[PDB]
Amino acid sequence: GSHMKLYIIGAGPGDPDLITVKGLKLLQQADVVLYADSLVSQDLIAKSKPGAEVLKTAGMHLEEMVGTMLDRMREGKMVVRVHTGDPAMYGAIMEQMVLLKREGVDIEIVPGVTSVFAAAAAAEAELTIPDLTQTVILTRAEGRTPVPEFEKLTDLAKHKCTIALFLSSTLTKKVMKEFINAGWSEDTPVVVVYKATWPDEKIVRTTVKDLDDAMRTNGIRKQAMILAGWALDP
Amino acid sequence: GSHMKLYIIGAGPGDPDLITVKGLKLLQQADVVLYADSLVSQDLIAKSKPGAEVLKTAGMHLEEMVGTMLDRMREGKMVVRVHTGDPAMYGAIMEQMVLLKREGVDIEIVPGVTSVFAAAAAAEAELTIPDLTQTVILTRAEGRTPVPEFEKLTDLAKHKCTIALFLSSTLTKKVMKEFINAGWSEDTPVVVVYKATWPDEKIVRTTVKDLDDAMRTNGIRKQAMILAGWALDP
Ligand SMILES: Nc1ncnc2c1ncn2[C@@H]1O[C@H](CSCC[C@H](N)C(=O)O)[C@@H](O)[C@H]1O
Numbered sequence: 001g002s003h004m005k006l007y008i009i010g011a012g013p014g015d016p017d018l019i020t021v022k023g024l025k026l027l028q029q030a031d032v033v034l035y036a037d038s039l040v041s042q043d044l045i046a047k048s049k050p051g052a053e054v055l056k057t058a059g060m061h062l063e064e065m066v067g068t069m070l071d072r073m074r075e076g077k078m079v080v081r082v083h084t085g086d087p088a089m090y091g092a093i094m095e096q097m098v099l100l101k102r103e104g105v106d107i108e109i110v111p112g113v114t115s116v117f118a119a120a121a122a123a124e125a126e127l128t129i130p131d132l133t134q135t136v137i138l139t140r141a142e143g144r145t146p147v148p149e150f151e152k153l154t155d156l157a158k159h160k161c162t163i164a165l166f167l168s169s170t171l172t173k174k175v176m177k178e179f180i181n182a183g184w185s186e187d188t189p190v191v192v193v194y195k196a197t198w199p200d201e202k203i204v205r206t207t208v209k210d211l212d213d214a215m216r217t218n219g220i221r222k223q224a225m226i227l228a229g230w231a232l233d234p
Numbered sequence: 235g236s237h238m239k240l241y242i243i244g245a246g247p248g249d250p251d252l253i254t255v256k257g258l259k260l261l262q263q264a265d266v267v268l269y270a271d272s273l274v275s276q277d278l279i280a281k282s283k284p285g286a287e288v289l290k291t292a293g294m295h296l297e298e299m300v301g302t303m304l305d306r307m308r309e310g311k312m313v314v315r316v317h318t319g320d321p322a323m324y325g326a327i328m329e330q331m332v333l334l335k336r337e338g339v340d341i342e343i344v345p346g347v348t349s350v351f352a353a354a355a356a357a358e359a360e361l362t363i364p365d366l367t368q369t370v371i372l373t374r375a376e377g378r379t380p381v382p383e384f385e386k387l388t389d390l391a392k393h394k395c396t397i398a399l400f401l402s403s404t405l406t407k408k409v410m411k412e413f414i415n416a417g418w419s420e421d422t423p424v425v426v427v428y429k430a431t432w433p434d435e436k437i438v439r440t441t442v443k444d445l446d447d448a449m450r451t452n453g454i455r456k457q458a459m460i461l462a463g464w465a466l467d468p
Pocket residue numbers: 013014039083084085086087088089090091113114115116118119165166167168169193194195196197198222223224225
């Protein structure tokens with residue numbers, strides 16, 4: 001009963017060809033494709049076969065998402081769900097999973113290249129430098145939505161190791177405040193990547209002091225990955 | 235002068251098909267392939283064309299590695315260098331880079347799926363759970379080689395968020411000590427993945443108290459990715 005099956009595909013950072021081999025194969029053969037997220041390309045979007053039912057989720061509600069996927073499955077069809085990057089990182093795949101596995105689905109997750117990785121790449125930075133830092137911290141700035149209590153950016157910034165920030169592009173005023181309160185220099189390097197591996201990509205290199213200016217002058221207000229730390233210097 | 239060029243390819247966690255699309259294309263057309271690391275499959279190894287000169291590096295010394303690559307380049311040949319996972323994470327690509335760019339090379343890095351990601355996948359864990367934790371910490375246990383001072387595992391374990399440990403498989407006695415000294419419960423979940431996405435893979439799920447036993451009973455002494463934290467529970 002291999003229709004009863006979810007694949008969760010990691011679609012890569014943006015470029016159509018950072019999709020693993022296997023991710024591309026599935027994507028090709030799926031009958032219903034669910035692209036949650038507007039952070040996939042029109043061009044990933046467009047390799048599924050002709051036929052495919054395509055659906056946007058995100059603005060859909062748990063239980064509806066889930067039942068649509070169960071209906072299609074019952075139907076004998078091949079469903080797949082397409083997350084940007086690697087689903088394990090701020091994917092939200094957990095709750096669907098558990099509903100799903102109750103109705104016996106099998107899951108299969110198909111890892112991805114996360115945009116962390118794509119940003120470092122663009123810049124040509126390893127994130128780990130012997131003697132310098134051996135830790136990379138991947139988190140998000142608190143905005144409205146507060147973060148758990150022992151995870152604040154100030155306190156995660158006191159190990160001084162490379163910090164890589166998802167969903168924070170328009171919180172660079174907090175970002176600098178917490179870095180300075182954990183006592184980073186105002187000179188430590190920042191690099192921002194804007195749509196990495198998109199044909200619109202922008203690479204901004206800058207520093208804690210200028211962050212917010214850099215952002216707002218480059219007009220990067222979304223999709224940007226911010227690496228901050230002395231491994232991004234030279 | 236597009237022979238003067240390094241691609242740094244991320245080869246994925248193990249399976250031949252977690253290699254991005256583009257990584258596979260390069261790998262196909264390269265004249266000299268440099269696989270540093272014995273952590274690639276015999277089967278990635280084996281898609282390069284017939285012809286290819288294949289070289290193992292690692293036990294080679296900086297400047298030799300570099301000059302061999304420059305000689306081949308001069309020669310008009312297509313070189314590529316194949317790191318496991320994503321090179322940005324404990325890649326060591328930095329020093330080659332800089333020598334290289336001096337002799338004017340261009341680099342191109344081709345991101346990857348890092349084994350972080352592959353482990354979470356196998357287990358079916360998102361690493362980020364709203365209300366639970368929003369931070370994933372990627373580091374390594376200190377062995378002989380000490381880690382920088384503000385990065386110790388105890389102190390990185392006091393945010394209580396998912397911690398993912400590369401190269402520490404045979405340091406699970408320190409691992410439990412530092413987790414317990416940062417006051418984790420002895421019950422918080424551990425999952426180890428052993429050769430993830432290899433055909434030998436092993437998934438061990440266990441807890442801080444049993445870690446070291448789990449390891450030594452499963453006999454996992456190498457290639458293992460250890461995720462530790464309440465998102466790996468259920
Ligand atoms: N191509 C891209 N360029 C840079 N960052 C992007 C990006 N796509 C993903 N992001 C980041 O990811 C956030 C979406 S959260 C989804 C992230 C994802 N699962 C991944 O693994 O990459 C955005 O705020 C930005 O922080």
